[PDB]
RNA sequence: UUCC
């Protein structure tokens, strides 16, 4: 099935991905890098006291608060769903090697027995109906850009003025670029408007990953994470190998003189892709309007904010099934990309824009440094984009693509195994749309709340209910995949967007409640994904702008966890043993300092006004903007706070751009 | 050195 072409950095095709400026050239050549992260100001993730603290705390919490998850994966009791050993990693030091991204996932999908297209006409109509409902009556809005984010290929600029210019120029020339692409002139579109080229692969830390303690040996065991070497990646797995990366941290002593306590490992690394900003801008200009529509009109299934917001919906259900999707981005099907583009064309979307969109989901990928002495290789030929990597994380609409795929996948699963009586309602496009429109508003006996690969499927009283229980049972048995599209299972310890669904003795949705995940509090406070970047003067540009603020939203976010008090007390006690200081006081000081620093960034904030006007969401986002990438959306954040993190392109320019893209 |  054809190996993907690959080119070394020295090749003109790779050289053309990096502009003649220092940042771009440095990004092209960056070698493998690792080191302790500055967990908080003046504290390294490998500080001996900190590791001693994590050692004591993880053992104590695991011992005293064993997971409470029943045979159907519902959590109850203490609200704990697994041991607390995930904190045992040397943050900043990755597993070796990281994976080479798969150039084609067609074989991966076929081998997993997943379909290479909609299986029935019903399904084809539902996927297309999703497109019609999602992309139809959009309202223009300013294109918002994350401060400090890189434009990646080819400029690698982090300057907001430059990013605004690139974005406006891109909206002005998107049409011309898309038409060149329609003509097969990809190099021309790339050379003239920087729309094309490749995604830039950056490996990110998943700071906590499963670790177990072998009762027999008393030794800890880290979860094996399988990685593909270059041969496997360019042949879609036909050749080369898939093997377990090494999370062994012993090497750190040998290599860096760092003491490694027993049971501490290197971090799981995941591939992330930064998109060529000039190509992403015209896509983002449409994506935001789409999010605004689905979060308003279809808020029921798509707009998720608080634990109570989720709770009110699930309470009305007779059955709630917490699903899990295996490796969603890598399994994402290219045929859905093509189905979507086709339907947008049928709807009247500008062909040149659809071509830009199609091309962003077929782009080559430049691999930086998966390990020492490896990398700096372009996979795929930019002159004719034809990769099938699945869903690229830096594509301007990745959340929407995952949501569209999965929402319909779950609905089909409900139709197939529980509601055949609803099939007659889906006869053509008009009826598919009316049915989906009703289903997405929570008006049918089968329902769902979802976001990309996380979801909870519900059944109210009715004919589908009995089928709902059979499906749940099938998932429990876990021998047969309920979907022809993705690998679906039930989540062990059902949760939705960070909140655990805590059931009581009845094990029914009506008497269940959503509570924060105490383990995530621990992940966030003691295993951040990034250091504090104390040398980046502009805090709004940091991955963690105001870490101290999270202390002020902690109670609101995690207060409902059954063992909240116990954990804060165990932390205080262990921190005392390790540092001879009070953790609470340490955090109160950090809270105070960051609160004062925040006023410097918020114009509508007195030169020392407190956090009075800010919401718990505002605070969590200021401490971790990444939660805006997977948990919340712009509309969930106070306006004066959103401005701290983002800057926008004029509404006049995006308005004129959208007008040329949309049908009506 | 990415994407609500
Ligand atoms: Mn879940």
- Closest by CA to A38, choosing from A93, A92, A94, is A92
* Distance from residue A321's CA to the centre of ligand 1 (Å): 9
Establish whether A79 is an annotated binding residue: no
Phi, psi (5° rounding) for residue A266?
A: -75, 155
Closest residue (CA) to C1' of nucleotide B3 is A394
Dihedral sign, Cα of residue A91, residue A535, residue A590, residue A47: positive
DSSP state string for A137-190: S------EEETT----TTT----HHHHHHHHHHHHHHHHHHHHHHHTT-HHHHH
C1' (B3) to CA (A279) span, angstroms: 13
Task: Please report where in the chains the tokens 């050289």 appear, as a residue.
Answer: A15
- Closest by CA to A361, choosing from A383, A381, A333, A342, is A333
> For chain A, how big is the Rg over CA atoms in Å?
25
* Distance from residue A445's CA to the centre of ligand 1 (Å): 21
Protein side of the strand B interface (CB < 7 A) = A 23-24, 26-27, 144-146, 148-150, 152, 156, 158, 200, 202, 204, 272-275, 277, 280, 284, 287-288, 291, 393-399, 451-452, 626, 628-630, 632-634, 646
Strand B: list positions under 7 Å from protein Cβ: 1-4
Nucleotide nearest to A400 (CA to C1'): B4
- Cβ density class A393-428: b for 16+ within 10 Å, e for less: bbbbbbbbbbbbbbbbbbbbbbbbbbbeebeebbee
End-to-end CA distance of chain A: 41
Please give the distance of CA A163 from its chain centroid, rounded to a whole number.
23
* Distance from residue A314's CA to the centre of ligand 1 (Å): 13
CA distance A431 to A429: 6
Supply A71's token pair.
Answer: 């045979």
C1' (B3) to CA (A54) span, angstroms: 32
* Distance from residue A331's CA to the centre of ligand 1 (Å): 18
Supply A596's token pair.
Answer: 């004062």
C1' (B3) to CA (A391) span, angstroms: 11
Q: Is A243 helix (H, G, I), strand (E, B) or coil?
A: strand
- Cβ neighbors of A372 (< 8 A, separation 6 or more) are A31, A32, A96
Task: Identify the helix (H) or strand (E) that includes residue A457.
Answer: strand A454-459
* Distance from residue A198's CA to the centre of ligand 1 (Å): 32
C1' (B1) to CA (A151) span, angstroms: 9
Nucleotide nearest to A151 (CA to C1'): B2
Across the strands, what pairs with A367? Answer: A201, A377
CA distance A249 to A92: 11
Dihedral sign, Cα of residue A506, residue A508, residue A509, residue A510: negative
Count the helices and strands in chain A (H runs, E runs).
25, 21
Phi, psi (5° rounding) for residue A195?
A: -105, 105
Please give the distance of CA A166 from its chain centroid, rounded to a whole number.
25
Q: Is A247 helix (H, G, I), strand (E, B) or coil?
A: coil
Nucleotide nearest to A625 (CA to C1'): B4
Across the strands, what pairs with A213? Answer: A220
Nucleotide nearest to A632 (CA to C1'): B4
Phi, psi (5° rounding) for residue A456?
A: -135, 130
C1' (B2) to CA (A609) span, angstroms: 34
Establish whether A111 is an annotated binding residue: no
CA distance A325 to A403: 12
* Distance from residue A494's CA to the centre of ligand 1 (Å): 5
Supply A262's token pair.
Answer: 């027993």
- Closest by CA to A414, choosing from A448, A438, A454, is A448
Nucleotide nearest to A273 (CA to C1'): B2
Nucleotide nearest to A396 (CA to C1'): B3
A310 burial (CB, 10 Å; 0-12 / 13-18 / 19+) is buried
* Distance from residue A324's CA to the centre of ligand 1 (Å): 6
Q: In what order do the strands lie in the sheet with A265-274?
A: A6-8, A377-379, A365-367, A199-206, A265-274, A89-94
Nucleotide nearest to A201 (CA to C1'): B2
- Closest by CA to A410, choosing from A339, A320, A337, A476, is A320
Task: Please report where in the chains the tokens 């021309």 appear, as a residue.
Answer: A188
Nucleotide nearest to A163 (CA to C1'): B2
Query: What ranges in A383-517 are assigned the alpha helix state H?
Result: 398-418, 429-440, 463-477
Task: Please report where in the chains the tokens 């976001």 appear, as a residue.
Answer: A451
Establish whether A490 is an annotated binding residue: yes
* Distance from residue A279's CA to the centre of ligand 1 (Å): 32
Residues A37/A531, Cβ–Cβ less than 8 Å: yes
Residues A180/A45, Cβ–Cβ less than 8 Å: no
Resolution (A): 1.9
Nucleotide nearest to A630 (CA to C1'): B4
* Distance from residue A405's CA to the centre of ligand 1 (Å): 16
C1' (B4) to CA (A634) span, angstroms: 6
Closest residue (CA) to C1' of nucleotide B4 is A633
Q: Is A304 helix (H, G, I), strand (E, B) or coil?
A: coil
Task: Identify the helix (H) or strand (E) that includes residue A490.
Answer: strand A488-490
Strands A377-379 vs A226-228: parallel, antiparallel or unpaired: unpaired
Q: Is A121 helix (H, G, I), strand (E, B) or coil?
A: helix
Cα–Cα distances (Å) from A326 to A114, A224, A330, A332, A406, in that order, read 12, 15, 9, 10, 12
- Closest by CA to A155, choosing from A278, A253, A239, A36, is A278
C1' (B3) to CA (A630) span, angstroms: 10
Task: Please report where in the chains the tokens 């909870």 appear, as a residue.
Answer: A456
C1' (B4) to CA (A142) span, angstroms: 13
Given its phi and psi angles, is residue A234 left (phi above 0), alpha (psi -120 to 50 degrees) or beta?
alpha
CA distance A190 to A177: 8
Cα–Cα distances (Å) from A284 to A71, A160, A239, A279, A648, in that order, read 43, 16, 37, 9, 12
- Cβ neighbors of A397 (< 8 A, separation 6 or more) are A283, A284, A286, A287, A290, A357
Residues A500/A634, Cβ–Cβ less than 8 Å: no
DSSP state string for A12-34: HHHHTTS-SSHHHHHHHHPPP--
CA distance A240 to A232: 4
Query: What ranges in A194-333 are assigned the alpha helix state H?
Result: 230-234, 251-256, 277-296, 299-302, 307-315, 328-331
Q: In what order do the strands lie in the sheet with A513-516?
A: A495-496, A499-502, A513-516
Residues A274/A365, Cβ–Cβ less than 8 Å: no
Describe chain A by its helix, strand, coil percentages, rounded to 5.
45, 15, 40
Cα–Cα distances (Å) from A272 to A40, A107, A199, A245, in that order, read 24, 22, 9, 17
* Distance from residue A248's CA to the centre of ligand 1 (Å): 30
CA distance A569 to A575: 10
Q: Is A436 helix (H, G, I), strand (E, B) or coil?
A: helix
Strands A144-146 vs A646-648: parallel, antiparallel or unpaired: antiparallel
C1' (B1) to CA (A3) span, angstroms: 28
Cα–Cα distances (Å) from A267 to A90, A206, A246, A347, in that order, read 7, 7, 10, 46
Residues A76/A507, Cβ–Cβ less than 8 Å: yes
Residues A244/A260, Cβ–Cβ less than 8 Å: no
C1' (B3) to CA (A74) span, angstroms: 32
Q: Does the bond joining A97 to the residue before it have cis omega, within 30 degrees of 0? A: yes
Supply A427's token pair.
Answer: 């006869």
* Distance from residue A538's CA to the centre of ligand 1 (Å): 35
Experimental method: X-ray
- Closest by CA to A264, choosing from A249, A277, A278, A246, is A249
C1' (B2) to CA (A430) span, angstroms: 37
DSSP state string for A536-602: -S-GGGSSSS-GGGHHHHHHHHHTTSTTHHHHHHHHHHHHHHHHSS-HHHHHHHHHHHHHHHHTTT-
Q: Does the bond joining A154 to the residue before it have cis omega, within 30 degrees of 0? A: yes
Q: Is A325 helix (H, G, I), strand (E, B) or coil?
A: strand
Task: Identify the helix (H) or strand (E) that includes residue A653.
Answer: helix A651-661
- Cβ neighbors of A366 (< 8 A, separation 6 or more) are A14, A17, A28, A153, A198, A199, A200, A201, A377, A378, A379
Task: Please report where in the chains the tokens 């009305």 appear, as a residue.
Answer: A316
Q: Go through the domains of chain A in sequence order and give each one's CATH number.
A: 1-30+102-276+333-397 (no CATH), 37-91+518-606 (1.10.490.60), 277-332+398-517 (3.30.70.1600), 607-664 (6.20.410.10)
Phi, psi (5° rounding) for residue A140?
A: -65, 155
Please give the distance of CA A400 from its chain centroid, rounded to a whole number.
11
Q: Is A377 helix (H, G, I), strand (E, B) or coil?
A: strand
């Amino acid at each position: 099935p054809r190996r993907a072409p690959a080119f070394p950095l020295s090749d003109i095709k790779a050289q053309m991905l990096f502009a003649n400026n220092i940042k771009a050239q440095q990004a092209s050549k960056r070698s493998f890098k690792e080191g302790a992260i500055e967990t908080y100001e003046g504290l390294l993730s490998v500080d001996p006291r900190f590791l001693s603290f994590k050692n004591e705390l993880s053992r104590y919490l695991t011992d005293h608060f064993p997971a409470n998850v029943d045979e159907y994966g519902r959590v109850y009791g203490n609200g704990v769903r697994t041991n607390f050993f995930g904190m045992r990693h040397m943050n900043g030091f990755p597993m070796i090697p990281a994976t080479w991204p798969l150039a084609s996932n067609l074989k991966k999908r076929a081998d997993a027995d997943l379909a290479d297209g909609p299986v029935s006409e019903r399904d084809n109509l539902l996927f297309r109906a999703a497109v019609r409902l999602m992309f139809s009556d959009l309202e223009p809005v300013p294109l918002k850009i994350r401060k400090g984010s890189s434009t990646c290929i080819p400029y690698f600029s982090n300057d907001m003025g430059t990013k605004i210019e690139i974005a406006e120029r891109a909206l002005e020339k998107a049409e011309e670029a898309g038409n060149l692409m329609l003509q097969g002139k990809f190099d021309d579109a790339y050379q003239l408007h920087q729309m094309g080229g490749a995604y830039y692969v950056v490996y990110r830390a998943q700071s906590t990953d499963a670790i177990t303690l072998d009762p027999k040996t008393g030794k800890f065991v880290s979860k094996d994470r399988m990685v593909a070497d270059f041969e496997y990646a360019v042949t879609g797995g036909e050749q080369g190998s898939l093997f377990a990366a090494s999370k062994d941290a012993s090497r750190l002593k040998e290599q860096y003189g760092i003491d490694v306590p027993d049971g501490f490992f290197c971090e799981r690394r995941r591939t992330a892709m930064g998109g060529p900003f000039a190509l992403n801008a015209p896509i983002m200009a449409v994506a935001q309007p789409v999010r605004n529509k689905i979060y308003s009109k279809y808020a029921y299934t798509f707009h998720h904010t608080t634990r109570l917001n989720k709770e009110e919906k699930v309470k009305e259900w007779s059955l709630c099934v917490a699903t899990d999707v295996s490796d969603h981005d890598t399994f994402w099907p290219g045929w859905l990309r093509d189905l979507i583009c086709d339907e947008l064309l049928n709807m009247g979307y500008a062909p040149w824009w659809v071509k830009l969109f199609e091309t962003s989901l077929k782009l080559p990928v430049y691999v930086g440094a998966p390990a020492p002495e490896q990398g700096h290789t372009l996979l795929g030929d930019p002159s004719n984009p034809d990769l099938e990597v699945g869903l690229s994380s830096g594509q301007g609409a990745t959340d929407l693509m995952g949501t569209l795929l999965m929402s319909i996948t779950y609905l089909v699963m409900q139709l197939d195994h529980t509601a055949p009586h609803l099939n007659s309602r889906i006869k053509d496009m008009p009826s598919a749309c009316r049915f989906l429109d009703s289903y997405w508003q929570g008006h049918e006996e089968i329902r769902q709340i979802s976001k990309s690969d996380d979801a909870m499927l519900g059944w109210t009283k009715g004919r589908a209910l009995v089928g709902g229980h059979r499906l749940f049972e099938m998932l429990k048995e876990g021998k047969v995949n309920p979907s022809p599209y993705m690998k679906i299972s039930y989540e062990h310890g059902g949760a939705f967007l960070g909140d655990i669904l805590l059931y009581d003795s009845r094990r029914e949705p009506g008497s269940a409640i959503f509570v924060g995940n105490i383990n995530s509090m621990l992940n966030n406070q003691f295993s951040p994904e990034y250091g504090v970047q104390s040398g980046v003067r502009d805090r709004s540009k940091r991955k963690r702008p105001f870490p101290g603020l999270a202390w002020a939203s902690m109670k609101d976010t995690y207060g409902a966890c059954p063992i909240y008090s116990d954990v804060l007390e165990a932390i205080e006690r262990c921190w005392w043993n390790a540092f001879g200081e009070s953790y609470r006081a340490y955090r109160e000081d950090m809270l105070k300092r960051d609160t004062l620093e925040l006023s410097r960034y918020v114009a509508s904030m007195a030169r020392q006004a407190g956090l009075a006007e800010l919401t718990p969401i505002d605070l969590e986002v200021l401490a971790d903007p990444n939660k805006l990438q997977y948990k919340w959306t712009e509309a969930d954040v106070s306006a004066n706070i959103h401005e701290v993190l983002m800057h926008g392109v004029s509404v006049e320019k995006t308005e004129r751009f959208l007008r040329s893209v949309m049908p009506r």
